[PDB]
Ligand binder design. Sequence first.
Ligand SMILES: CCCCCCCCCCCCCCCCC[C@@H](O)O[C@H](CO[C@H](O)CCCCCCCCCCCCCCC)COP(=O)(O)OCC[N+](C)(C)C
Ligand SMILES: CCCCCCCCCCCCCCCCC[C@@H](O)O[C@H](CO[C@H](O)CCCCCCCCCCCCCCC)COP(=O)(O)OCC[N+](C)(C)C
Ligand SMILES: CCCCCCCC/C=C\CCCCCCCC(=O)O[C@H](COC(=O)CCCCCCC/C=C/CCCCCCCC)COP(=O)(O)OCCN
Ligand SMILES: CCCCCCCC/C=C\CCCCCCCC(=O)O[C@H](COC(=O)CCCCCCC/C=C/CCCCCCCC)COP(=O)(O)OCCN
Lengths: 347, 98, 114, 71, 105, 129, 99, 303, 83, 70
Amino acid sequence: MNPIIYTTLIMTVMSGTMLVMISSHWLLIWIGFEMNLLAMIPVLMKNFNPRATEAATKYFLTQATASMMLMMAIIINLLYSGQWTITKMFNPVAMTMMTMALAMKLGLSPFHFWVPEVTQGISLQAGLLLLTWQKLAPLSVLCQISQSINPNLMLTMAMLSILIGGWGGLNQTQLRKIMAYSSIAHMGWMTAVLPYNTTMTILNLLIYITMTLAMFMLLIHSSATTTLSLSHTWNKMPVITSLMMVTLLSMGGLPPLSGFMPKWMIIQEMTKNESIIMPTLMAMTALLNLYFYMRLAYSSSLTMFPSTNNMKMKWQFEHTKQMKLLPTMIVLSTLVLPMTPALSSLN
Amino acid sequence: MPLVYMNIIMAFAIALAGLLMYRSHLMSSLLCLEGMMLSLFIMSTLIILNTHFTLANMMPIILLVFAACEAALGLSLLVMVSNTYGTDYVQNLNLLQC
Amino acid sequence: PGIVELPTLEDLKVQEVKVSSSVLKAAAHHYGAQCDKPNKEFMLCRWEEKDPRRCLEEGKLVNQCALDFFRQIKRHCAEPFTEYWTCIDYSGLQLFRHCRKQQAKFDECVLDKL
Amino acid sequence: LFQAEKDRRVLQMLRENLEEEAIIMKDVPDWKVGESVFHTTRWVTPMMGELYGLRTNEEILSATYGFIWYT
Amino acid sequence: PFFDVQKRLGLDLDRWMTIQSAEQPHKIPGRCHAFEKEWIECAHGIGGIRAEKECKIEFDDFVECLLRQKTMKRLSAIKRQRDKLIKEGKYTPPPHHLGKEDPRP
Amino acid sequence: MTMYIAFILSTIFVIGFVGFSSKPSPIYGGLGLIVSGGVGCGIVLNFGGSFLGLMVFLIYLGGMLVVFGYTTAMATGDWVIYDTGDSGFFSEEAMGIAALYSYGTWLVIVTGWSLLIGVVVIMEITRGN
Amino acid sequence: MNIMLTLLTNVTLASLLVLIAFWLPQLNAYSEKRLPFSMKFFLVAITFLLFDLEIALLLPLPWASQTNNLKTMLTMALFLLILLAASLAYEWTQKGLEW
Amino acid sequence: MFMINILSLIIPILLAVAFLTLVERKVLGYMQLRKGPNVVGPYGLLQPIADALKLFTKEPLRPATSSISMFIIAPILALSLALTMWVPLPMPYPLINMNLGVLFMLAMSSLAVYSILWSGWASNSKYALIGALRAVAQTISYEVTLAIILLSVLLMNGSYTLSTLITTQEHIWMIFTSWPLAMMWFISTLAETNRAPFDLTAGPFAMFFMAEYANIIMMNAFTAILFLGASHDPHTPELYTINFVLKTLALTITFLWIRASYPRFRYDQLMHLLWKSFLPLTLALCMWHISLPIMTASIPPQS
Amino acid sequence: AGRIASFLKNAWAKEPVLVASFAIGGLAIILPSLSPYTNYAIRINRATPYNYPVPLRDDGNMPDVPSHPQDPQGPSLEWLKNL
Amino acid sequence: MWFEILPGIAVMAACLFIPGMATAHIHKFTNGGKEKRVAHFSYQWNLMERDRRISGVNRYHVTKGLENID
Ligand SMILES: CCCCCCCCCCCCCCCCC[C@@H](O)O[C@H](CO[C@H](O)CCCCCCCCCCCCCCC)COP(=O)(O)OCC[N+](C)(C)C
Ligand SMILES: CCCCCCCCCCCCCCCCC[C@@H](O)O[C@H](CO[C@H](O)CCCCCCCCCCCCCCC)COP(=O)(O)OCC[N+](C)(C)C
Ligand SMILES: CCCCCCCC/C=C\CCCCCCCC(=O)O[C@H](COC(=O)CCCCCCC/C=C/CCCCCCCC)COP(=O)(O)OCCN
Ligand SMILES: CCCCCCCC/C=C\CCCCCCCC(=O)O[C@H](COC(=O)CCCCCCC/C=C/CCCCCCCC)COP(=O)(O)OCCN
């Protein structure tokens, strides 16, 4: 598309998210969600193809259903209490439907089926945008009404999301599907501490966003979509493969890397409320995420896969367009564990 | 809580079920979506007018506008789906899979 | 929780004003100009007490004062007022614009008499 | 004048409804005749059903739908 | 999460529509203006937990004004009992409830 | 009491939603949708919201469902919740809706921007390539 | 009630007269013997829908004129019409109105 | 005595649309140096009766393979809307008084396209389907401008009430206040009812014909009331009725004149005409009519 | 100056509709800020009594509030009558 | 000649004369020889209800004049 139109659509997406975050009226929040959905669709369809169109229509159907459920729950809440301000829900039934609407928007299981297919269909830049920025608004809405969420529903959906992400990440070969399942598992981790401490939720959001931004930027730099295309990378830019392996180890939760910060802290918080079984289950389940990250690292950097003759020509040309903030993202996603108490800034 | 609100909520639930069934014909899916929207409009209008909450009379119209825009968007997508396959059958969207 | 108190039907008995809406509209301006003090006392009591049960006496006073006003109209200017309210009653909207002539006749008559 | 007549008519309708409630509810054991449903003692504007609950269906329909149906 | 830009800048972007009793056009009152006002003044600057625990009476009155469930229950009980007596035959409606009354302005 | 006319209209609304909820022959589902929209407009008009009912009956039926049918063809208990007082010498619904321009500046701005962005999005999607 | 009676009378008369027109010539016995999907039609339909939405937004203007905030109301109305004109201009310039 | 009023509003409209065919034939004939029907009856007065009887005694050509449901539904809806749009109008006193009469007329006009859509879909032919799609697109495109011009004109009236239009134009016609809007409304009414130069296209056929002619006369009366106001004396409404009928008949003669006097547009030519000449001027004049009452402190009273 | 005039002359030919539309729109946008009657329109809107004027309670210190409608105190609508 | 078009047009005139006047006459006959009272804005509806209750015949058009003031 035209660069002006693309910039305008990005502005509209960000403005809708900001409107959702800064508004104290339910109708304005719904309007922000509608604007976000309306402007997000062409971004997925920048590179026109049947796969992109199918992913876009799946995403549109899911988001429209979620928005209708959200509006209907708002209507019930208004019925049982004539209040428009975003505060305590005031209705048991309204709360359940709003939670499902926000879970549909986020992608938590069992509403997770659309995420892998939408991520696979669209390009890498669109996948980066979808998996990073589209999650700020529903998470902010959930944080604003954390005192009203039923702990049983939220915690069981978080458990299901972590289990499903861990299990589904093992079978996938394409990198985009692996990233989608990783996002599902990370949000399963993330929404489990909402009833207890939203600061941990925001900290996990920041850390996850940093790691996944680094990961998609590295995947864009070395234009690889399948596992073997990534295995071919070591023959040209071994530094990229090494940095990607370090980032993958960080995303697995291995100390002293940055990815160990959220889980640990989250576990600590859930131990303050005398919840012991669930953090243990979450760690043992995240071992599966670690396993498929380790398999990807084995395929990418720790071993040298067979190359192709034509690769010699790629030796002669340099990466023309260089993306900024990649070194900063890698450093922030790998070596920030000693600055953990900074989470007291209520980030 | 009178029977009118119960009937409207039941209509919304029936429309949601019809949307989630997916026999075929994605056009029917959009129709079920917009039936849910119509039920929402009716319920919101009744609730707002019943309590004489005057400043809330803006809310339904705005709602309708936005929802209709979404419908247009959906229609556009449907068209391209047909243009790719010749028909709007739901089962044609099996290229992307878990 | 609690018992509501309602005045007895003997407390709600008063001589009603048995004239139609058009008759009231015909003399609305003079009624407002002359009957103003009891009207304002009643209405101020109404928005201050915020309770119909605390404003019965002022309602009886406003009914009595309106009856006195209409009795004066009947005594002095019966026929011009009759023509004026007939003209006002004929129209569907009950417009003052239709027959300013009868209004002027009634106004000059009541200015001469009262 | 219209406000005064409205208040008087509303009070009379409420009083008649209270008298009929007292007549009918004489045999119900735990019923308190004329019991408010609000904790506060402030005056509350009655609903349409609180006034025309026990009246004929014709005038109920009039009072609820006449202005809307008058065209 | 909630970046309160409005209170920082004093813009009042969407706070006028939040409640029934906030500057309606032509000063048209809400159906439950008094109850909502009383509850809001009860629960202002007190906190969510304490407002829920302490201002429950005002919120109950507000919900009763909004939905009138108890009024419906009372009216339905009265109507059913009146129907039962008129069926068995120990009650007769007065002329006021038969349309034979003398209406007043 | 006209046999709970609001209840009758609500039941007919539910019957219409059941009718097109089976999704048979999308044109017939559309026809059921016009029927249900007409019933809903009747409910709104009977309640007292004349302008909102007319907004439904005009916008929804005349434009939006007409576009739906165009695209399809191209392819192969009551009366007690009411008030007691009067509205004055005006209709409250009309005043509340007309307050959109004097009060709802933010709503007007966001809705206009959303509509313009929707136009741009439709053009971008339907461009093809 | 009156409008319901009028609508019922209209529909009843229309149905009766159509059925008699359809059945009067049926009493006497006689012999009794795709792909294209043009995009422009859909584009104009969508344009009509969106302009109808903006017209719905513009509709309450007759009552919007009495608000005592004449400057703000005028600015908002002119803003809405300017956005309508800008949408039309954008659809014009990138060949959205071609046959 | 309400059913009598409904019947006395319905039957004369049907008689008028019956004799409108005779009047149109006579006018086009005399505009073409010939005579219209003048053999059947005194001056062709019995021609509509013969036409109706012949149409009702001729067998219907039912396709026997299409959907009979929509095939029979479409004329019902068309005739019902055509007869219903008559009631809101005030001549001088409207049969049914509705605060939002104009919006009701707009909603009926918007619904009028369903008959065309359903007839085209049930015709069971691709060519008829294409023709129906073209007609629907033209109708919706032109009703957009109809609605915008209508609200712009009503901005000087005070409300959507049709009766108030008589009071607004008590001293001067609205034709002088805004003639460009009146001309654009006239052309939009021409194009909405599929009349020349915009007419690109037994029982049910006569049904559709009567619905179309009733729509013509209804739109004519609406235009006459909106833009050409007659003086109304409350003690003698007959003068207003006579003036209104005369203006409506003059407008109908004007449509027959325009049909007889011009060639016809193409589909793309009329679409471009609308979208690139009427809509820009429509928006500009809508802005002007928004700004004018505030500029001159002449805001209409009712609210 | 010359280029703008030449472009306006070119646009007035072969495209008068757009020129008229833009002229009317710009004129309608600009004029209200200059017209002196907009304040009169605002005042007329303010002077229309839609609600009943609730009287104030006398405390002996309200000289600007009239005690009767006929009293000279209070706002006057002679300016509207003169219009 | 051209005036031969006048008869048919005249018929339409008659066919358009019938509705309007008829309604007016009906509006008089049902409403005691006066214009039908229109009810907008819900205030004048209360006026007709008060008139109906005052009249004592349950008809609003029955106008009780000053003679009823005693
Ligand atoms: C990898 C770790 C995350 C890094 C994220 C990127 C770092 C660069 C960001 C640049 C500065 C960020 C914010 C810009 C400063 C101005 C905005 C400021 O006014 O916001 C304040 C808030 O300040 C920010 O929140 C703090 C941002 C600092 C983020 C770093 C914390 C990460 C902890 C663990 C990693 C240690 C740092 C490693 C090096 C960066 C207002 O707070 P308030 O509106 O009243 O409360 C809203 C939150 N509520 C609703 C929950 C109550
Ligand atoms: C402040 C930051 C500016 C730069 C950043 C802008 C961010 C995005 C742009 C959107 C924000 C614009 C702020 C407008 C908020 C509306 C409220 C404020 O403006 O006050 C209004 C003042 O009204 C002004 O006229 C608002 C005019 C602004 C709209 C015109 C241009 C808007 C463009 C914004 C982007 C939209 C798309 C791009 C268009 C070019 C209220 O008027 P007032 O009478 O006191 O109150 C009425 C209520 N009463 C009855 C209780 C008294
Ligand atoms: C101080 C500030 C003053 C305020 C400003 C106001 C001044 C405005 C001045 C200009 C406004 C005039 C606008 C008139 C409408 C413009 C429409 C138009 O221009 O379109 C025509 C087209 O119009 C038509 O051709 C329509 C033909 C349809 C047949 C109708 C025959 C016309 C004769 C019928 C008489 C009209 C009846 C009017 C009175 C009706 C009474 C109700 C041009 O199209 P093209 O030639 O293709 O040019 C574009 C390519 N360059
Ligand atoms: C700031 C005011 C905004 C509000 C007013 C306007 C609201 C509605 C009017 C605008 C509607 C949308 C306009 C869309 C513009 C499209 C431009 C375009 O692309 O058209 C060009 C042609 O148009 C042009 O020539 C460019 C602009 C023409 C003139 C524009 C304005 C010129 C100056 C206006 C003000 C005049 C000076 C003021 C005089 C005051 C009196 C003394 C292409 O021609 P086609 O029709 O596609 O080709 C068909 C034939 N093959």
